[PDB]
C-alpha cells in the first residue's frame, strides 16, 4: 500500500543514476582494496554511496546490507557483473532487494546497458519495463539452455551438464543470468559461491514466477548469508541438482 | 559506372528498417522466417541490383563480380530459445573484395556496418580500433562443448574470463568492440563469418583459419576473429598437444 511509495522513490533513484554512470564509466578505475579475491571499481562504490544517501534522505530507519532480525533491510549489489563492467561495459546490473521482517517485498535488477528494469513487487507482480512477467513455460533440461561458470566445477560434471541440456550460454552477471531464467530464456542458472547481494533480488522473482530457487543440496536459502545456489525452471530443477550431485560432487578439486 | 557504395548503403539500411516488421509475427506462435528473410532480400537484389547474386544456406566460384552473402538470422538457437542475441549478417563483395558488411543486432536495436573507404559504425557512430588486449587481460568466447577438455582448460587458464553469446556475428562484434579478446568457431558456414572480413580489415583485427591463414570467404573453415595482441597466444593453445578437436 505504501510499497507504492517506496517503489516510486526507488524508480526515481534508478532514473537519476542514468546521469551519473557515464561520467563514472569515462573516469573509471579498479581497486583491489578491502577485498580478498573480488574486483571493485569507483563506479560501484559511488552507486553505493549514492544509495546509502537515498536511504538517509528518505528511510532513516532502513538498514543496508552491502559491501540479523532487523525489520527494514535493503540488500544491494551496486554493480553485479564487475568483470563485465570493466572488460565490456555491458552485462552488468544494479541489484536491490527489500525485506520487511525477513519477507521479500520489493526487488530490482536494473540492466542499465540495455535499459531494462526488472522489478518484483509483492501483491502486484514481476515486471520487465512495465510488461508483466508470468511463470515461464515448462522447460525440461534437454530443451533448456543453461548457464553456469564452467571454470569452477570439475570438467566431468560440466560435460554431463552439456549432455543433459539443449545448450550452454553465459552472460556473466548473476542478476542477468538469473533474469533469463525468470523470462524462460534459460532453463537454469547456477552460482556455486554467491555473495548475498548476488542473489538477494531473486527470492521474490522466484516466488512470484514459480521458479525453483534453492541451495545445490535443494534446501532453502537464508537471504542474509547465501550458499551455492540454483534458480531454475521448475521443470528442470531436480535434473540439474541430480547431475550436479552425482559421482561425489561438482567441486573442481578432488 | 555501377551503383555507388553510398547509394547501396542507403538502400540496405532502409531495407533493414523494413523488417523491424518481420518480427512479429515471427516470433509469435518455424523458422528455417529465415527463408522469408532470405527471399525478401532475394527480391531486393532483383528490384534494385540486376547483376548481383546471393549465397545463402542452399540454392559459384570467382570470377563472380557482384556477390552478397547472408545469414538471414545468425543465432537460430538463440532466436528459438531466448528470442534474443541473434542477428542478420550481410556481406557485399566486389570481384572478390569485401565492400560492405552489416551485422544487425535486432533485439538491442544496433546496426553494425562496415564500409570500404568510410569506416565501421554502430548506429552511425564510428568504431575505432580497439585497445591492445593480451590474453591474460581479455575475455574469450568459444563453444566449449566442441573441443576436448584439455584445450578448454588452457583457454580458461590463459585468459581473463569466459563468456558466450551464441551467435557468431554477435560474439565477433564483441571482439570488434574490444569487449572480447577473441572469438573462435571451429565450423562456420560462409554466412556465419562473411561480414566480419571487412570489420577485421577496417578495425585492424586478425581473422584467420585456426592455422592462422587466409579464409576462403566462399567456403567454411574453423576460425578465429581476434584482437591483434592475443591472436597468437590463442592459436598456440588451440594447436598444442595434438589439437582442439574433442574425441570420445
Cα A90 versus chain centre, distance: 15
Let me know: does B113 contact B9? Beta carbons within 8 Å: yes
A219 CB-near residues (< 8 Å, 6+ apart): none
Let me know: does B139 contact B181? Beta carbons within 8 Å: yes
Which of B186, B192, B236, B230 minimizes the C-alpha distance to B209? B186
- B149, B160, B164 ranked by CB distance to A170: nearest: B164
A175 CB-near residues (< 8 Å, 6+ apart): A77, A80, A81, A93, A95, A109, A111, A198, A201, A202
* A8 close contact with B: CB closer than 8 A: no
Residue labelled with grid coordinates 530464456: A185
- A87, A169, A180 ranked by CB distance to B164: nearest: A169
Method: X-ray
* B152 close contact with A: CB closer than 8 A: yes
Q: Where are the domains of chain A?
A: 1-134, 135-254
What is the chain A residue with the closest CA to B157?
A: A151
Q: Give the integer Cα–Cα distance in Å for A49 and A93.
A: 16
For residue A147 the three cell numbers come to: 548457464
Q: Which of the four CATH numbers 3.20.20.120, 1.20.140.10, 3.40.190.10, 3.40.190.80 does domain B129-248 have?
A: 3.40.190.80
What is the chain B residue with the closest CA to A185?
A: B82
For residue A34 the three cell numbers come to: 578491502
Let me know: does A164 contact A243? Beta carbons within 8 Å: yes
C-alpha angle with apex A42: A39 to A45, nearest 5 degrees? 85
Q: Domain A1-134 class? A: alpha beta
φ/ψ bin of B24: left (φ > 0), alpha (ψ from -120 to 50), beta (otherwise): beta
Residue A43: DSSP 8-state: H
* B162 close contact with A: CB closer than 8 A: yes
Cross-chain Cβ contact A169/B174 below 8 Å: no
For residue B228 the three cell numbers come to: 591483434
Q: Give the integer Cα–Cα distance in Å for A52 and B14.
A: 47
The neighbour count for residue B188, using CB atoms within 10 Å, is: 20
The neighbour count for residue A77, using CB atoms within 10 Å, is: 30
* B10 close contact with A: CB closer than 8 A: no
Interface test with B, best of A141, A151, A152, A185 (most B CBs within 10 A): A151
CA quadruple B147, B153, B156, B159: dihedral positive or negative?
Answer: negative
* A194 close contact with B: CB closer than 8 A: no
CATH code for the structural domain at B1-128: 3.30.540.10
Which residues, listed in sequence order, are joined to residue B55 by a DSSP beta bridge?
Answer: B69
Q: Show the DSSP H helices in chain A as ranges.
A: 3-17, 21-26, 42-58, 82-87, 155-164, 174-182, 196-199, 202-209, 237-244
Cross-chain Cβ contact B179/A145 below 8 Å: no
For residue A117 the three cell numbers come to: 528494469
- Pairing between strand A229-232 and B119-122? unpaired
Which of B139, B149, B210 minimizes the C-alpha distance to A81? B139
- Tell me the fold of A135-254: D-Maltodextrin-Binding Protein; domain 2 (3.40.190)
- Contact list, A151 vs chain B (CB under 8 Å): 156, 161-162
For residue A161 the three cell numbers come to: 551438464
Amino acid at each position: 500500500k505504501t510499497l507504492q511509495q517506496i517503489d516510486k522513490l526507488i524508480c526515481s533513484w534508478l532514473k537519476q543514476i542514468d546521469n551519473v554512470i557515464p561520467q563514472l564509466i569515462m573516469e573509471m578505475t579498479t581497486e583491489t582494496k578491502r577485498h580478498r579475491f573480488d574486483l571493485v571499481t569507483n563506479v560501484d562504490k559511488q552507486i553505493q554511496q549514492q544509495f546509502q544517501q537515498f536511504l538517509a534522505t528518505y528511510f532513516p530507519e532502513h538498514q543496508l546490507l552491502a559491501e540479523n532480525e532487523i525489520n527494514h533491510l535493503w540488500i544491494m549489489d551496486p554493480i553485479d557483473g564487475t568483470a563485465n563492467l570493466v572488460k565490456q561495459q555491458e552485462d552488468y546490473c544494479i541489484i536491490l532487494a527489500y525485506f520487511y521482517e525477513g519477507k521479500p517485498m520489493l526487488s530490482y535488477v536494473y540492466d542499465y546497458p540495455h535499459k531494462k528494469l526488472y522489478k518484483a513487487i509483492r501483491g502486484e507482480g514481476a515486471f520487465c519495463n512495465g510488461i508483466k512477467m508470468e511463470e515461464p513455460p515448462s522447460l525440461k533440461l534437454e530443451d533448456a539452455i543453461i548457464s553456469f561458470n564452467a571454470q569452477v566445477m570439475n570438467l566431468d560434471t560440466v560435460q554431463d551438464l552439456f549432455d543433459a541440456s539443449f545448450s550452454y550460454r553465459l552472460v556473466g552477471a548473476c542478476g542477468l543470468d538469473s533474469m533469463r531464467v525468470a523470462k524462460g530464456q534459460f532453463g537454469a542458472h547456477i552460482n556455486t559461491n554467491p555473495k548475498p547481494w548476488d542473489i538477494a533480488a531473486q527470492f521474490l522473482f522466484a516466488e512470484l514466477l514459480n521458479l525453483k530457487m534453492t541451495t545445490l543440496d535443494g534446501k532453502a536459502i537464508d537471504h542474509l548469508k547465501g550458499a551455492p545456489f540454483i534458480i531454475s525452471n521448475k521443470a528442470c530443477h531436480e535434473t540439474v541438482l541430480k547431475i550436479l550431485n552425482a559421482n561425489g560432487g561438482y567441486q573442481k578439486y578432488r
